[PDB]
């Protein structure tokens with residue numbers, strides 16, 4: 001039962017996400033990606049070695065590439081959530097509420113899978129952008145990604161695998177205290193099952209792990225603070241970077257945050 005639950009979620013994870021932490025760790029360790037570290041190498045990656053609204057500048061171009069990836073991750077997470085039979089039973093409007101307030105939390109948790117202290121993978125792992133380069137972009141674009149790295153570095157210390165992330169992401173999305181939920185008791189009931197499956201799965205997959213389950217519950221709270229600060233950055237960019245095109249889907253997500 002609780003094992004069949006964890007297996008069903010893990011299969012939905014494998015079936016809906018192109019880049020798993022397993023694959024990403026193969027590329028990051030060397031079992032190679034083109035390194036994008038300055039304007040010169042960025043342009044070479046665009047020509048064909050690695051790869052949108054009209055061009056504007058280098059910083060905005062990086063923004064557009066990150067924006068497209070997150071939009072794609074939003075699509076995958078939507079199919080992941082739907083692949084959970086309990087989630088699909090909720091009314092479509094409640095489904096939209098869970099995704100609205102949950103995707104960025106899941107996205108940032110999965111971002112740690114393709115990230116180390118020096119950069120992150122891009123374009124199905126065929127490229128690698130250095131943390132230095134992102135830092136050197138024009139404000140405020142250089143301030144967006146740095147808090148994600150600091151979270152990711154600490155999150156990867158836990159050394160979760162794809163089987164853990166599937167349940168961890170499922171618990172992020174099925175959060176009972178999202179604003180505007182119609183059937184709060186139903187969602188909370190689904191989350192409690194997922195959480196019980198998570199601890200159950202962690203006991204078997206990480207026997208020697210001390211406090212791993214409560215640490216993940218703290219990580220979930222961290223992710224909510226990370227998204228709150230991320231939503232503010234994006235709202236400030238909407239006000240001061242009027243020339244930067246914001247994706248309408250991400251606009252709706254941030255609309256009331």
Ligand SMILES: O=C(O)CCCc1cc2cc(Cl)ccc2n1S(=O)(=O)c1ccc2ncsc2c1
Nearest residue numbers: 062063066067069070137141144145148234250
């Ligand atoms: O509004 C939005 O959320 C879209 C915009 C999101 C976004 C724009 C952006 C621009 C720069 Cl110069 C640095 C980080 C940036 N981020 S991010 O930190 O959130 C990010 C970066 C890479 C990535 N690869 C899979 S996911 C994912 C997420």
